[PDB]
Amino acid sequence: QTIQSIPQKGFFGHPRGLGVLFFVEFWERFSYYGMRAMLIFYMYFAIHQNGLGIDKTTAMSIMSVYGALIYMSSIPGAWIADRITGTRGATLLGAVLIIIGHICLSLPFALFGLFSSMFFIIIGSGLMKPNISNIVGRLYPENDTRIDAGFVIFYMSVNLGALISPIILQHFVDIRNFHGGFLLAAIGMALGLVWYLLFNRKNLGSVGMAPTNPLSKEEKRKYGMIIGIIVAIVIVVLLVTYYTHTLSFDLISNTVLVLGVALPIIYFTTMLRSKDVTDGERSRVKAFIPLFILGMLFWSIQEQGSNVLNIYGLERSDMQLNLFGWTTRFGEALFQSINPLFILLFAPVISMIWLKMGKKQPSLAIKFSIGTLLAGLSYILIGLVGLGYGHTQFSVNWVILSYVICVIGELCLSPTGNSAAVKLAPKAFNAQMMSVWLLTNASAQAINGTLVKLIKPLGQTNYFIFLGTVAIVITLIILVFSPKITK
Ligand SMILES: CCCCCCCC/C=C\CCCCCCCC(=O)OC[C@H](O)CO
Ligand SMILES: CCCCCCCC/C=C\CCCCCCCC(=O)OC[C@H](O)CO
Ligand SMILES: CCC[C@@](C)(CCO)SC[C@H](N)C(=O)NCC(=O)O
């Protein structure tokens, strides 16, 4: 038994291993969100400003495609752990690969340093992200009730890292020391790695030391050829286009757009066509399709606060926080700290609101609809502010209000999405249903990579109104079918 080799207490009434993984996750999320907060400015800021001088639209597209690839790579990353290395090996290789990606950004390698960093962090995150989560849950015995509270604690390390890192790295953006800031994220990530190496063995024991479903001799030969062919075609295409000078980011953004559309179709089709899935289990799968659209519409608007809403704030607002006499300069990277702060303050609050309502509480479909409508209302708000002022510079309080409306929507949607990938899940497709809730974000970010190209022809203000309205109309059309969706 994997529970015999591990302490069952030691970190706030939870297995001691939760403490080890909380410190490790904190530092990976701190360094990920810190690098992320800086990356957008580092890309489009001029060369004289220690930036890369990349086209603003291209820099915006990269942010979304990068985000989409991190979430898409968790699919093979969980498979690798499940069939080859185990979750422990995969978490460790991921962590090492992630540190390499952070070092790439610290060195003076310009565009090479940027794309090589993305490569190592995409691969590392796909290996580390789903596998650290798996280890956390496997620390609790079969009938253990603490498991849900254990994840609530684990995900606090995520938002604490996401909250603190933009506050720390705002200074490096201000003095234009990007390499110094990316080095700080690198060192932060090394602290996380050092802690795992020091404490993993006695606290986590045998948990995830081997793959659950290892590959046969003929399966190693089969998968090896298929992946070999796919990887080789990908390297050939990338190299041939490079030296012929037909290699642009559109090659990546279009490929990832295709992937963001195809993967959800492939997943829903496989589940609705399976012989092992019962008609009752099949009915819950089709019931998830509207929740997938609602989820996608939410993350499309939400994930745009990292590349669209922040540049708009920097360029159109006074960047001056002003609340009841308290006036201060607001650093552009601090826009990334808004959403994790509100999650930290009001996620336990909302959890009690639903618990007091009990069974009389709103359904999965209503909660998702509330969240998406709020995401759409946050874009109608900022769109109307720009329309109202025109060329006139407005208060950053407006841009901050847009972030606050969106995160209030996330508090409705997020605990509801995570609980849906297990409830509406068939017995054989539990890991596959885990992929569809993760794909609501991977697909939204994949659409975002191409969607950002509409800002120039439509106009930034018309773009917020158009995207805001589309979100609200689709939500209102789905909302009327909410009683039938609940199965
Ligand atoms: C550390 C992370 C950052 C946390 C940031 C603190 C959150 C502030 C909360 C709400 C925004 C203010 C209320 C909404 C705006 C009020 C309207 C306003 O300012 O009006 C301007 C003008 O005076 C008339 O048009
Ligand atoms: C928990 C529930 C949260 C509910 C969330 C509701 C969101 C409401 C949406 C949009 C309001 C738009 C207001 C209009 C924007 C202000 C325009 C403005 O100030 O215009 C400047 C004026 O023209 C002088 O120059
Ligand atoms: C609309 C919000 C966009 C955005 C920039 C959040 C606002 O601070 S997205 C990134 C955000 N820091 C985040 O998701 N971190 C928290 C987390 O991972 O849960």
Author numbering: 9 to 495
Which sentences did the original study use to describe this structure?
We first show that S-Cys-Gly-3M3SH is actively taken up by S. hominis through a specific secondary active transporter, STAH0001_1446 (SH1446), a member of the proton coupled oligopeptide transporter (POT) family. POT transporters belong to the Major Facilitator Superfamily (MFS) and use an inwardly directed proton electrochemical gradient to drive the concentrative uptake of di- and tri-peptides across the cell membrane for metabolic assimilation. We and others have demonstrated that S-Cys-Gly-3M3SH can be taken up and metabolised by a highly limited range of staphylococcal species present in the axilla, namely Staphylococcus hominis, Staphylococcus haemolyticus and Staphylocooccus lugdunensis, to liberate 3M3SH, that subsequently exits the cell through an undefined mechanism. While S-Cys-Gly-3M3SH is a highly modified and uniquely human dipeptide, we reasoned that this moiety might dictate the uptake mechanism into malodour producing bacteria and here we identify a peptide transporter, PepTSh (SH1446), from the POT family of secondary active transporters as being responsible for this process.
To gain further insight into the mechanism of substrate binding we successfully obtained a high-resolution co-crystal structure of PepTSh at 2.5 Å resolution, bound to S-Cys-Gly-3M3SH using the in meso crystallisation method. PepTSh adopts the canonical MFS fold with helices H1-H6 forming the N-terminal bundle and H7-H12 the C-terminal bundle. PepTSh was crystallised in an inward open state, observed previously for other members of the POT family, wherein the extracellular gate, consisting of helices H1-2 and H7-8 from the N- and C-terminal bundles respectively, is closed and the intracellular gate, consisting of helices H4-5 and H10-11 is open. Unlike previous POT structures however, PepTSh also contains a well-structured β-hairpin motif between helices H7 and H8 on the extracellular side of the membrane, extending out in line with the lipid head groups. Interestingly we observed a number of monoolein lipid molecules that cluster around both the β- hairpin and the cavity created between helices HA and HB with the transporter domain. The Cys-Gly part of the precursor is positioned such that the carboxy termini of the peptide faces towards the intracellular side of the binding site. The terminal carboxyl group makes two hydrogen bond interactions, one with Tyr41 on H1 and a second interaction to a water molecule (W107), which links the carboxyl group with Asn347 on H8. The carbonyl group of the CG peptide also makes a hydrogen bond to this water molecule, creating a well-coordinated interaction network between the peptide and Asn347. The terminal amino group makes two further polar interactions, with a water molecule that sits next to Tyr41 and also to the carbonyl group of Gln344, which sits further up on H8.
